[PDB]
Design an enzyme around this catalytic site. Structure first.
Site, PDB file in Angstrom:
ATOM      1  N   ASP A 257       0.897  -1.179   0.170  1.00 50.91           N
ATOM      2  CA  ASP A 257      -0.083   0.020  -0.047  1.00 50.91           C
ATOM      3  C   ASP A 257       0.905   1.255  -0.112  1.00 50.91           C
ATOM      4  OD1 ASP A 257      -2.877   1.068   0.420  1.00 50.91           O
ATOM      5  OD2 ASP A 257      -1.435   2.139   1.889  1.00 50.91           O
TER       6      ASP A 257
ATOM      7  N   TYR B 255       3.067  10.111   0.572  1.00 51.69           N
ATOM      8  CA  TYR B 255       4.031   9.456   1.450  1.00 51.69           C
ATOM      9  C   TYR B 255       5.391   9.863   1.236  1.00 51.69           C
ATOM     10  CZ  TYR B 255      -0.195   6.679   2.972  1.00 51.69           C
ATOM     11  OH  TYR B 255      -1.345   6.160   3.173  1.00 51.69           O
TER      12      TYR B 255
ATOM     13  N   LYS C  43      -2.582   5.877  -4.612  1.00 49.78           N
ATOM     14  CA  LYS C  43      -3.524   6.827  -4.113  1.00 49.78           C
ATOM     15  C   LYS C  43      -3.519   8.247  -4.685  1.00 49.78           C
ATOM     16  CE  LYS C  43      -3.897   4.562   0.245  1.00 49.78           C
ATOM     17  NZ  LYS C  43      -2.260   4.461   0.679  1.00 49.78           N
TER      18      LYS C  43
ATOM     19  N   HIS D  84      -7.597   9.286  -2.568  1.00 54.04           N
ATOM     20  CA  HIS D  84      -7.069   8.955  -1.064  1.00 54.04           C
ATOM     21  C   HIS D  84      -8.047   9.490  -0.119  1.00 54.04           C
ATOM     22  CE1 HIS D  84      -3.010   9.047   1.028  1.00 54.04           C
ATOM     23  NE2 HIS D  84      -3.924   8.574   1.820  1.00 54.04           N
TER      24      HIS D  84
HETATM   25  N1  LIG Z   1      -5.935   5.847   3.127  1.00 55.15           N
HETATM   26  C1  LIG Z   1      -5.703   6.389   4.008  1.00 55.15           C
HETATM   27  O1  LIG Z   1      -6.046   7.602   4.491  1.00 55.15           O
HETATM   28  C2  LIG Z   1      -4.510   5.985   5.218  1.00 55.15           C
HETATM   29  C3  LIG Z   1      -4.446   6.333   6.337  1.00 55.15           C
HETATM   30  C4  LIG Z   1      -3.481   6.019   7.244  1.00 55.15           C
HETATM   31  C5  LIG Z   1      -2.815   4.755   6.804  1.00 55.15           C
HETATM   32  N2  LIG Z   1      -2.977   4.243   5.812  1.00 55.15           N
HETATM   33  C6  LIG Z   1      -2.295   2.945   5.187  1.00 55.15           C
HETATM   34  O2  LIG Z   1      -2.101   2.062   6.302  1.00 55.15           O
HETATM   35  C7  LIG Z   1      -1.076   1.659   6.702  1.00 55.15           C
HETATM   36  C8  LIG Z   1      -1.128   1.229   8.173  1.00 55.15           C
HETATM   37  O3  LIG Z   1      -1.339   2.127   9.132  1.00 55.15           O
HETATM   38  P1  LIG Z   1      -0.460   3.112   9.895  1.00 55.15           P
HETATM   39  O4  LIG Z   1       0.838   3.291   9.125  1.00 55.15           O
HETATM   40  O5  LIG Z   1      -1.235   4.423  10.203  1.00 55.15           O
HETATM   41  O6  LIG Z   1      -0.248   2.276  11.365  1.00 55.15           O
HETATM   42  P2  LIG Z   1      -0.342   0.915  11.811  1.00 55.15           P
HETATM   43  O7  LIG Z   1       0.040  -0.171  10.534  1.00 55.15           O
HETATM   44  O8  LIG Z   1      -1.540   0.835  12.718  1.00 55.15           O
HETATM   45  O9  LIG Z   1       0.838   0.880  12.994  1.00 55.15           O
HETATM   46  C9  LIG Z   1       2.256   1.133  12.630  1.00 55.15           C
HETATM   47  C10 LIG Z   1       3.165   1.143  13.657  1.00 55.15           C
HETATM   48  O10 LIG Z   1       3.006   0.157  14.271  1.00 55.15           O
HETATM   49  C11 LIG Z   1       4.439  -0.630  14.667  1.00 55.15           C
HETATM   50  N3  LIG Z   1       4.542  -2.060  14.440  1.00 55.15           N
HETATM   51  C12 LIG Z   1       4.066  -2.770  13.338  1.00 55.15           C
HETATM   52  N4  LIG Z   1       4.354  -4.009  13.547  1.00 55.15           N
HETATM   53  C13 LIG Z   1       4.373  -4.235  14.688  1.00 55.15           C
HETATM   54  C14 LIG Z   1       4.471  -5.282  15.819  1.00 55.15           C
HETATM   55  N5  LIG Z   1       4.323  -6.365  15.308  1.00 55.15           N
HETATM   56  N6  LIG Z   1       4.606  -5.056  17.015  1.00 55.15           N
HETATM   57  C15 LIG Z   1       4.674  -3.746  17.357  1.00 55.15           C
HETATM   58  N7  LIG Z   1       4.616  -2.661  16.761  1.00 55.15           N
HETATM   59  C16 LIG Z   1       4.464  -2.845  15.580  1.00 55.15           C
HETATM   60  C17 LIG Z   1       5.095   0.051  13.730  1.00 55.15           C
HETATM   61  O11 LIG Z   1       6.782   0.203  13.880  1.00 55.15           O
HETATM   62  P3  LIG Z   1       7.742   0.044  13.028  1.00 55.15           P
HETATM   63  O12 LIG Z   1       7.655   0.424  11.804  1.00 55.15           O
HETATM   64  O13 LIG Z   1       9.114   0.759  13.908  1.00 55.15           O
HETATM   65  O14 LIG Z   1       8.138  -1.714  13.131  1.00 55.15           O
HETATM   66  C18 LIG Z   1       4.452   1.679  13.489  1.00 55.15           C
HETATM   67  O15 LIG Z   1       5.040   2.195  14.505  1.00 55.15           O
HETATM   68  C19 LIG Z   1      -0.188   3.010   6.454  1.00 55.15           C
HETATM   69  O16 LIG Z   1       1.262   2.651   6.604  1.00 55.15           O
HETATM   70  C20 LIG Z   1      -0.783   3.260   5.085  1.00 55.15           C
HETATM   71  O17 LIG Z   1      -0.066   2.302   4.122  1.00 55.15           O
HETATM   72  C21 LIG Z   1      -3.837   4.705   4.680  1.00 55.15           C
HETATM   73  O1  LIG Z   2      -3.871  10.396   4.677  1.00 59.04           O
HETATM   74  C1  LIG Z   2      -2.962   9.230   5.041  1.00 59.04           C
HETATM   75  O2  LIG Z   2      -2.893   8.426   4.327  1.00 59.04           O
HETATM   76  C2  LIG Z   2      -2.412   9.344   6.532  1.00 59.04           C
HETATM   77  O3  LIG Z   2      -2.053  10.559   6.986  1.00 59.04           O
HETATM   78  C3  LIG Z   2      -1.489  11.500   6.321  1.00 59.04           C
HETATM   79  C4  LIG Z   2      -0.076  11.265   5.842  1.00 59.04           C
HETATM   80  C5  LIG Z   2       0.412  12.385   5.301  1.00 59.04           C
HETATM   81 CL1  LIG Z   2       1.956  12.081   4.328  1.00 59.04          CL
HETATM   82  C6  LIG Z   2       0.269  13.596   5.555  1.00 59.04           C
HETATM   83  C7  LIG Z   2      -0.610  14.134   6.282  1.00 59.04           C
HETATM   84  C8  LIG Z   2      -1.789  12.990   6.857  1.00 59.04           C
HETATM   85  C9  LIG Z   2      -2.711  13.184   7.530  1.00 59.04           C
HETATM   86  O4  LIG Z   2      -2.975  14.425   8.003  1.00 59.04           O
HETATM   87  N1  LIG Z   2      -3.969  12.851   7.426  1.00 59.04           N
HETATM   88  C10 LIG Z   2      -5.122  13.113   8.031  1.00 59.04           C
HETATM   89  C11 LIG Z   2      -6.165  13.681   7.190  1.00 59.04           C
HETATM   90  C12 LIG Z   2      -7.321  13.807   7.287  1.00 59.04           C
HETATM   91  C13 LIG Z   2      -8.478  14.219   6.381  1.00 59.04           C
HETATM   92  C14 LIG Z   2      -7.907  14.926   5.129  1.00 59.04           C
HETATM   93 BR1  LIG Z   2      -9.057  15.569   3.987  1.00 59.04          BR
HETATM   94  C15 LIG Z   2      -6.582  14.844   4.890  1.00 59.04           C
HETATM   95  C16 LIG Z   2      -5.600  14.192   5.872  1.00 59.04           C
END
Ligand SMILES: NC(=O)c1ccc[n+]([C@@H]2O[C@H](COP(=O)([O-])OP(=O)(O)OC[C@H]3O[C@@H](n4cnc5c(N)ncnc54)[C@H](OP(=O)(O)O)[C@@H]3O)[C@@H](O)[C@H]2O)c1
Ligand SMILES: O=C(O)COc1cc(Cl)ccc1C(=O)NCc1ccc(Br)cc1
Length: 316
Positions: free
Chosen positions: A44, A49, A78, A111
């Site tokens: 993803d 990012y 995205k 996104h």
């Molecule tokens: N569409 C959107 O708007 C949106 C928004 C948010 C996220 N996303 C996507 O979803 C992905 C995942 O969400 P997220 O990055 O917000 O957070 P997450 O996956 O809920 O948590 C990531 C954190 O958890 C830690 N971690 C990972 N595996 C672990 C384990 N087995 N034990 C303990 N800690 C662990 C990581 O540390 P380390 O990396 O230091 O190991 C990092 O600090 C994002 O990276 C992105 O690709 C999309």
């Molecule tokens: O949107 C994401 O995927 C994760 O969140 C962020 C990632 C980056 Cl690189 C920069 C900013 C954000 C963030 O602030 N996300 C929260 C958000 C909520 C509503 C709107 Br609209 C836009 C971003």
């Protein structure tokens, strides 16, 4: 449980993927290489990012090494908010393709439902700190996404952070050509999303759960916020199953027929997080985890709350 889920475009999507938000550019190439080596087939990504070039280096190296074939990978990116305009969508997609060193994406998502003023800044603000909207709407942005399918740049299109009314708006679009394949939303035991998930699933849209571990590395974390990984109730379920809390948090959405995309740059955790296909949470475990809902969101942003299409004013 099977490793892939069937999308409404006829393609199969791996239910476990690697997240890349916050993965530092000097670490994400190795993270993705390790992930592919240990079995991940779904990454993803997003332009916002700022690490797609480095993700792409890993993908390209593993393709060149013949660790995997391109058809076996499922790469998601995205469209950022500052590219909602008709004349910008193709170029935004192409920049992502060029950075990822791909000829197509498996899935390309809007996104966020909100369009922002185009320009260099990802969050253009007025002098009082409010995001500057674009007058684009979600329906015209969707039409632009449909064109990408018809040009061969992407195999599937979808949405992210769309609320139930916004999903409905797309489904009810006059002249709709392709339904969204996926709605990618925040989902974990503190934000269980039962209403929105049921709606999307009932319409044949696959839901991807982001921040499944509660995003402990989110840059706006406060020392006081609730912590899934440290919740003794979840730790207890993990202990019962001889698994880690993270493994329980990843298996949970899988059993709800969701795709899940935990992020790590730690090689040991990347591997740990993939070892979730050989145990099962009971129905009682599932209901117990659901009971922890508190409507707590990682992902929200004050500067964007007055945008007409900001998604989190609606209940769901
Ligand atoms: N569409 C959107 O708007 C949106 C928004 C948010 C996220 N996303 C996507 O979803 C992905 C995942 O969400 P997220 O990055 O917000 O957070 P997450 O996956 O809920 O948590 C990531 C954190 O958890 C830690 N971690 C990972 N595996 C672990 C384990 N087995 N034990 C303990 N800690 C662990 C990581 O540390 P380390 O990396 O230091 O190991 C990092 O600090 C994002 O990276 C992105 O690709 C999309
Ligand atoms: O949107 C994401 O995927 C994760 O969140 C962020 C990632 C980056 Cl690189 C920069 C900013 C954000 C963030 O602030 N996300 C929260 C958000 C909520 C509503 C709107 Br609209 C836009 C971003």
């Amino acid at each position: 449980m099977a490793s892939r889920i069937l999308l409404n475009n006829g393609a199969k999507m791996p239910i476990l993927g690697l997240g890349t938000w916050k993965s530092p550019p000097g670490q994400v190439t190795e993270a993705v290489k390790v992930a592919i080596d240990v079995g991940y087939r779904h990454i993803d990504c997003a332009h916002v990012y700022q690490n797609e070039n480095e993700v792409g280096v890993a993908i390209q190296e593993k393709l060149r090494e013949q660790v995997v074939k391109r058809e076996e990978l499922f790469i998601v990116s995205k469209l950022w908010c500052t590219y909602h305009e008709k004349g910008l969508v193709k170029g935004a997609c192409q920049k992502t393709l060029s950075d990822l060193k791909l000829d197509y994406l498996d899935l390309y998502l809007i996104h966020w439902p909100t369009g922002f003023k185009p320009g260099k800044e990802f969050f253009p603000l007025d002098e009082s700190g409010n995001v500057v909207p674009s007058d684009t709407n979600i329906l015209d942005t969707w039409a632009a996404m449909e064109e990408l399918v018809d040009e061969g740049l992407v195999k599937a299109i979808g949405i992210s952070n769309f609320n139930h009314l916004q999903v409905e708006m797309i489904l009810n679009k006059p002249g709709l050509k392709y339904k969204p394949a996926v709605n990618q939303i925040e989902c974990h035991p503190y934000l269980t999303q039962e209403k929105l998930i049921q709606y999307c699933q009932s319409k044949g849209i696959v839901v991807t759960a982001y921040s499944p571990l509660g995003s402990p590395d989110r840059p706006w974390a406060k020392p006081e916020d609730p912590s899934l990984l440290e919740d003794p109730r979840i730790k207890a379920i993990a202990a019962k199953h001889n698994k880690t809390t993270a493994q329980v948090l990843i298996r949970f959405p899988m059993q709800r027929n969701l795709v899940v995309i935990p992020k790590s740059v730690t090689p040991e955790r990347i591997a740990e997080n993939f070892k979730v296909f050989d145990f099962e949470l009971s129905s009682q475990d599932m209901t117990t985890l659901l009971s922890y809902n508190r409507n707590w969101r990682v992902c929200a942003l004050l500067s964007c709350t007055s945008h007409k299409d900001y998604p989190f004013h609606e209940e769901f």
